[PDB]
Amino acid sequence: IVGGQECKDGECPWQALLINEENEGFCGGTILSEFYILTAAHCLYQAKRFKVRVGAVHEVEVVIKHNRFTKETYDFDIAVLRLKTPITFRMNVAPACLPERDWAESTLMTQKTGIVSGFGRTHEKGEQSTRLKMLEVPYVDRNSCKLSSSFIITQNMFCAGYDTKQEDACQGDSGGPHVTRFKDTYFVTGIVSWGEGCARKGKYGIYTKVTAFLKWIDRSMK
């Protein structure tokens, strides 16, 4: 996270971290339940092997990646991980809510802002953060985003962040949570997907649009 602020203790409890064999983070995720983690399909190509850390380390049983994922455009950039051993909810470890689709479209996606979080780089050409960070990102008009983007923006993506202000998600945050607050309850709205650099002028953060996949998520969690 470039800019933003460090999470207070207990403030960002749905955050998961994907770690390689040497316990180094390379991607984020979102806790959905005791057994399920939401992440980006592109994160599945970042390491040979990985596990999930919350707050405890958990091994993955099944990877359920979207059949339509494309490395070329990052369209359909969504996966669900089923864990081998259930997560124990506790201080700093709790799931984000899955909204109803219709309501999420009409009400959550129309809020002014959401919140992105992660352990990733604190500058495009910098180092990852030891402490968990969060950042409030304005939702960005779809036309504004298409105007800004060198690459295709599909119906499975949305844009959030700032035109010129130097705050954004970055390398190491991808796969992580974008949540929207509605009266003190935090709902899953996005997955950190891609960007042209980090916090660049005239560029926004691009996110997997979770509303497009709420049925797919329910099916995958059975």
């Binding site: 207990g10 403030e11 960002c12 409890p13 749905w14 909810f89 506790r90 201080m91 700093n92 470890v93 709790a94 799931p95 984000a96 809510c97 899955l98 909204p99 109803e100 219709d102 309501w103 009409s106 009400t107 949540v179 509605f182 009266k183 003190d184 309850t185 935090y186 709902f187």
Partner: protein, 49 residues
């Protein structure tokens, strides 16, 4: 119409006539039919305090 004005006063989900409120898994709709009440210590979407 009615859900587009302060969410029909619902805490969480609103549907429409009349307003019908509902809640995410792990919550119970309150007696007033508007509020959403947790069932356990770690309901989804709440910061841990």
């Amino acid at each position: 119409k009615l859900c587009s004005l302060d969410n029909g006063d619902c805490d969480q989900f609103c549907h429409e006539n009349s307003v019908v409120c509902s809640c995410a898994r792990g919550y119970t709709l309150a007696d007033n039919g508007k509020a959403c009440i947790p069932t356990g210590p770690y309901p989804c979407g709440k910061q841990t305090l």
